[PDB]
Structures are given as structure tokens and as C-alpha cells.
Design a binder for this molecule. Structure first.
Ligand SMILES: Nc1nc2c(ncn2[C@@H]2O[C@H](COP(=O)(O)OP(=O)(O)OP(=O)(O)O)[C@@H](O)[C@H]2O)c(=O)[nH]1
Ligand SMILES: [Mg+2]
Lengths: 186, 147
């Protein structure tokens, strides 16, 4: 039914929202309100879904998440890979509450972890980012086993993507796994 | 004018002509933080660090207009220009903004550069023991008459 995009400030949520629809680069600013749009898949069936993007500001994240988690069918959490090492704690704290509020639902939706800004060589690998997330969340749960997404009863995936892609947006768009995941979960 | 942007409440920039004069790295992010948290309400206050910034809200279509000038003193024609450009936007681009969905906004393209430049030219041309004394007599008066 619905796919909700979540992430911190300057995480590329607006860019991911716009690239999957138009494919032409547009200047973006800080999200302070919501944005919902209808998108039809490129397959033969042409199923129509609603993409909903919420502001990444801490002052409005919960107020909109607790209201929009009633009709969410899938969730995509976008994590900045270039600036992950300097904000490990914040994204982990956000994900800690995101997981609880998602588990509180009647039907468990699908989870995507989009390690954005993969164009920069500083961006870390998805496997290493997942390992770091597990290590940090194990301590977050304390503050009998280390946290494992396999133990977590959710359909969680980890992928790599980039909206602007640095020099990669001049000719095409480096978004290939996201559409395949959307088709798989469609 | 040295900086001017028109972006929606959804964090998408619709049109700008900043050019090489100014780069919109973080001049509007601080203004957004001030509006969301500080709730300025100080009649276009909060110059950030190097240039004065002023804003205008549009709750009818969820839009904001931002104009940035240098910290040097500037005339009051900026607010009139902002009102005029907002009214022109509402008059002409009403079809896209009235629609709630952002798909129409994404599809539409606005060629507002020439009209804004003409407005800027007009604005620049305009810029260039109570002691009671008394007497020793009495008053005199008469009376009215009726049926
Ligand atoms: N090179 C590159 N830069 C990116 C990418 N994604 C985001 N950015 C950076 O993000 C900046 C723009 O901000 P957005 O990406 O729109 O982030 P945002 O939508 O404001 O996120 P919120 O603050 O939650 O609204 C650009 O100047 C880019 O430097 C990416 O995939 N590649
Ligand atoms: Mg945004």
C-alpha cells in the first residue's frame, strides 16, 4: 500500500523521493512538512503505490511517524555513509525507536537500509555498516546475546545507493537495487 | 538583491538565480531552524553570519520566499518586491500550487526568470486654602417663552 521514507537531516530523502519519479536533478532544501505521491511500477502489472516522505528534523520526526505508521506497508531508512562515523550514535538512537514503533504494528512491514552517498570513496560498505549498527545497538539496548537482524523477526535488507552520485548523475542515475527491491516486495 | 530562493515546505527548491554571487550551502537552513525552534516573529530578523536574510510565508499553498541581501543597509523596497512577486506567483502559477499532490509540481516547469528580472529592474529604478476672587456686583438674565 504505502512506503515511508525515514532518515536524519540532510539524508537525501527528498532526492530519493524525486529521482524515482522524475529522473531530473532538482535543488532541494530542508524538509519541514510531509510529501506524498503516487508512483506506478515499471513492470507490466503497473501497480500503484504511495511514497510518503516525512521531515528529518528531530523536532517533528515522532509527531509524524506515530501518525503515519498506521497505514505504512514498507519502510526505507536512509543512512548517510559518508558522514556515518561522526554521527553513529544519532542514527542508531533513531533506529532504536523506529524498530519498536514498527514492531508495535499489527502487521510487520518490510525494512530497507539504504546506505546513501555511496559515490564518495569515504562511504563504507553495507556489510561493515550493518556490523557497526549491530555493535552499537547491542550497547544501546543495555544503556543475553548481541543484536542480530537474523534474530530480529523482520524482513530487513541492506543495500547501497546514491541520489546525486557525485559525477554519476551527468548521464544516468545510479539507482538499480532500490527498484528491484520495490518490485520484489510489490 | 544578491540572493533569492522560492522553495516549498517539502524541501524542494522551485526556482533561483543565485549564480556565482552566492552559493546556497547553508544560508536558509539556519533560517529554517530559527522558524521551527526559535519562532522568531521579529519581522524578518536573524541575519545569520554575513548577510541579512528575510522570509515570507504562504500558508495557502505551503510556500516560502527567501531574499538575502548584504549586511549593508538596504532600502525598504525589498518587502514591496517580495509582496509583488508573491502576488504574481499566486496569480499565474495558481494551477500547480493549488494541487495538493507534488507530482504536478514536479512535472511543471516555471520560466519566471525574465519576469523576476523585470521586477528587479523596476525596483532598482525606483531605488535610484482655596483663594477665590470675585467681584462686587450681581448677574442679570431673562427667561424664555412658550405656548
Ligand atoms: N554526491 C551526493 N550528495 C548527496 C547525495 N544525497 C544527498 N547529498 C547531499 O545532500 C544535499 C542536499 O540535501 P538533501 O539530499 O535533499 O537532504 P534533505 O532532503 O534536505 O534531508 P532532510 O534534511 O531530512 O530534508 C546536497 O548538497 C548533497 O551534497 C548523494 O547521493 N550523492
Ligand atoms: Mg528533505
Amino acid at each position: 500500500r504505502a512506503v515511508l521514507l525515514v532518515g536524519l537531516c540532510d539524508s537525501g530523502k527528498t532526492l530519493l523521493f524525486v529521482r524515482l519519479l522524475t529522473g531530473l536533478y532538482r535543488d532541494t532544501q530542508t524538509s519541514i512538512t510531509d510529501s506524498c505521491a503516487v508512483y506506478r511500477v515499471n513492470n507490466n502489472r503497473g501497480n500503484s503505490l504511495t511514497l510518503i516522505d516525512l521531515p528529518g528534523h528531530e523536532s517533528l520526526r515522532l509527531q509524524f511517524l506515530e501518525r503515519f505508521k498506521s497505514s505504512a506497508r514498507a519502510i526505507v531508512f536512509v543512512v548517510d555513509s559518508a558522514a556515518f562515523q561522526r554521527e553513529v550514535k544519532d542514527v542508531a538512537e533513531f533506529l532504536y525507536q523506529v524498530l519498536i514503533d514498527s514492531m508495535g504494528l499489527k502487521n510487520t512491514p518490510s525494512f530497507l537500509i539504504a546506505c546513501n552517498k555511496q559515490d564518495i570513496a569515504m562511504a563504507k560498505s553495507a556489510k561493515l555498516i550493518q556490523q557497526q549498527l549491530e555493535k552499537e545497538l547491542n550497547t544501546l539496548r543495555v544503556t543475553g546475546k548481541e543484536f542480530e537482524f537474523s534474530q530480529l523477526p523482520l524482513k530487513v535488507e541492506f543495500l547501497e545507493c546514491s541520489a546525486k552520485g557525485g559525477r554519476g548523475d551527468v548521464g544516468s542515475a545510479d539507482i538499480q537495487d532500490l527498484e528491484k527491491w520495490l518490485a520484489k516486495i510489490a | 538583491l544578491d540572493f533569492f530562493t522560492i522553495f516549498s515546505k517539502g524541501g524542494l527548491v522551485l526556482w533561483c538565480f543565485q549564480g556565482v554571487s552566492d552559493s546556497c550551502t547553508g544560508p536558509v537552513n539556519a533560517l529554517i531552524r530559527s522558524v521551527l525552534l526559535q519562532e522568531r516573529g521579529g519581522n524578518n530578523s536573524f541575519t545569520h553570519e554575513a548577510l541579512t536574510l528575510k522570509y515570507k510565508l504562504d500558508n495557502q499553498f505551503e510556500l516560502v520566499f527567501v531574499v538575502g541581501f548584504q549586511k549593508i543597509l538596504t532600502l525598504t523596497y525589498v518587502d514591496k518586491l517580495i509582496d509583488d512577486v508573491h502576488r504574481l506567483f499566486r496569480d499565474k502559477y495558481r494551477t500547480e500550487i493549488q494541487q495538493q499532490s507534488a507530482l504536478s509540481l514536479l512535472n511543471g516547469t516555471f520560466d519566471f526568470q525574465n519576469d523576476f528580472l523585470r521586477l528587479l529592474r523596476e525596483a532598482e529604478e525606483s531605488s535610484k486654602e482655596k483663594g477665590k476672587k470675585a467681584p462686587r456686583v450681581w448677574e442679570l438674565g431673562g427667561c424664555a417663552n412658550k405656548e
